[PDB]
Amino acid sequence: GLVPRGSHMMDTRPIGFLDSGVGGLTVVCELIRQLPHEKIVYIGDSARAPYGPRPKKQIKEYTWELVNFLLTQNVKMIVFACNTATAVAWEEVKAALDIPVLGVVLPGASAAIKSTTKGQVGVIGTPMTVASDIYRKKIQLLAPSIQVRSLACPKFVPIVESSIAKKIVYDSLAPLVGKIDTLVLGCTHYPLLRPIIQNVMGPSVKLIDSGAECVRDISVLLNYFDINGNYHQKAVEHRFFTTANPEIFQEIASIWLKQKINVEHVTL
Amino acid sequence: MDTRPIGFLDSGVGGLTVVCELIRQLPHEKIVYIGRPKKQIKEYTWELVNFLLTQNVKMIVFACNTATAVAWEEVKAALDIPVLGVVLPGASAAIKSTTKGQVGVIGTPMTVASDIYRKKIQLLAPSIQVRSLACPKFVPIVESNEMCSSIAKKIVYDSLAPLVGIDTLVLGCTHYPLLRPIIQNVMGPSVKLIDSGAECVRDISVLLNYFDINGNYHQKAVEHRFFTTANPEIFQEIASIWLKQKINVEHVTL
Secondary structure (H helix, E strand, C coil): CECCCCCCECCCCCEEEEECCCCCHHHHHHHHHHCCCCCEEEEECHHHCCCCCCCHHHHHHHHHHHHHHHHCCCCCEEEECCHHHHHHHHHHHHHHCCCCEEECHHHHHHHHHHHCCCCEEEEEECHHHHHHCHHHHHHHHHCCCCEEEEEECCCHHHHHCCHHHHHHHHHHHCCCCCCCCEEEECCCCHHHHHHHHHHHHCCCCEEEEHHHHHHHHHHHHHHHCCCCCCCCCCCCCCEEEECCCHHHHHHHHHHHCCCCCCEEECCC | CCCCCEEEECCCCCCHHHHHHHHHHCCCCCEEEECCCHHHHHHHHHHHHHHHHHCCCCEEEECCHHHHHHHHHHHHHHCCCCEEECHHHHHHHHHHHCCCCEEEEEECHHHHHHCHHHHHHHHHCCCCEEEEEECCCCCCCCCHHHCCHHHHHHHHHHHHCCCCCCCEEEECCCCHHHHHHHHHHHCCCCCEEECHHHHHHHHHHHHHHHCCCCCCCCCCCCCCEEEECCCHHHHHHHHHHHCCCCCCEEECCC
């Protein structure tokens, strides 16, 4: 990609995102807001969700299909937005690919480590993510002495897709109130409930948005690897794929991205 | 956990300020620090890199700005460990921090002459305006704060006058951050100052995570090593003051 009226060539490839559903779209929203000039290719494998309870073998197998589909789309980078896919095959995919491979869990974990005051970290997410305990594992793999308390908030995802909402958050986070100094939003759906969560936890707790942290890593890594696009070139050629139920996918997508986005249904 | 030290190379001693930034943001990481035509500066840099590699560093940071301009990309393409300079991160921060796209940059005659800052800024964001000033009068002062502020203001302004009245100023020299308060004053309150060294340390964090080479978080690194090819005496005095702790240096002959 030659810069118009310019002299240098800049990468024109898009950044790829894989997920077993629509939650990852919030990481996509963060990308658009921070790096408006970067193209996106999103593949949501809802047809085989939930990944969570399935055997590692299948998860590795499904993840790779998502990876290869992204590669056929000529992506310069791949972002894991699915917690289970990240826990099971993120490591091997990253070691094998020739392009940068990132996840959302890692930067959220790291930011928690760097932001805690007394060493009391909280993690809220889905029963599955809390069940895998992946955030605590990543956090403690780097700083084993950090105390991590993880709580499932099963009413959160439904609320995302009102005074009742307020009550629900207050009751769901109650067990955490006053017991931590840092809280990881361990579900990509939760960034939409941030203001209420901040209100329930009080000003004494710092909120860590894993998706935003991840998007910050993307910015530094694109530059580090010299695959950044022209900063003045607004991007719009965004591709969205799903392996199932495109109707609701477009519903949720159009809403969060605040623009009618077009979803393409595909078969892997 | 990778207990290896992070390496820092410098043509001078100003890079010591990036080290300080490292200590402040990453108290747990150990440090190994060591601090004319092109081909010559290139070779000299390689010798500095060779030294750091014998010290078993897991990463190399170019503190100096002229060294970065001259050999950073060459060394980075040739090593198996991460390598970064301060220019790109300063460049990237200015672009994100710029309001009207009017960015200025001050540094050493050598640094400005290379025009590395406008080049990297425009390389990422081609339509951003960049004004690069020269300040050969700004030499490393140990405790510039001990000098009467009104004296420093006159001297600072005397070099930064042409630039007065750009919306972002990049500190293109590693020891310039020691003169920040004055620079901030002389440049007025509507000029956001960019500290390249500090932006670099923020990048270091991302890359230590990316390459999975973070050190042990539950301890304060206390085994840093400072080397110089020159006057070890003047060096320790400078370093002890900037790091607010009596550090011990070792003279080496490259």
